[PDB]
Amino acid sequence: AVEDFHKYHTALVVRLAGVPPHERYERLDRWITEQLIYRDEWIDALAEAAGIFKEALERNITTPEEFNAFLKEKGKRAVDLVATLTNAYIAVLEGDPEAIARFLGISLEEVQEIIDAARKAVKEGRGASIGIYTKLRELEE
Secondary structure (H helix, E strand, C coil), rough: CCCHHHHHHHHHHHHCCCCCHHHHHHHHHHHHHHHHHHHHHHHHHHHHHHHHHHHCCCCCCCCCCHHHHHHHHCCCHHHHHHHHHHHHHHHHHHHHHHHHHHHHHHCCHHHHHHHHHHHHHHHHHCCCHHHHHHHHHHHHH
16 A cells, blocks of 8 residues: 555646656656655655545545545544645655755755645645656656
């Protein structure tokens, strides 16, 4: 389930962001989750969240707010669990932007563009990864 988290998470985020499917997003997503670990609490959180995103993929959830409505149907536990992972993604970006740049083959300035899109997406309730993937799509093309 821990390994499956980035498969379900990326698949939903790509669907809700509307960007074309591409292997770069799953690759970055696995890199981010591994930065989180390098804690068993995050392992437990990713395993539990993996089923939440799996069920969202199996429902007619096509917008970020349809996902938020789904989380609130799931309960306050699901809402807060995703919010915690969202802010964890932000901390990982803001924590080692130099490694992210070398990993994606971009400059530090372009990593700051990803940080800005992610933080903006969080404040508008869309989660961090929608901003990351949309910005990454624009950077590569």
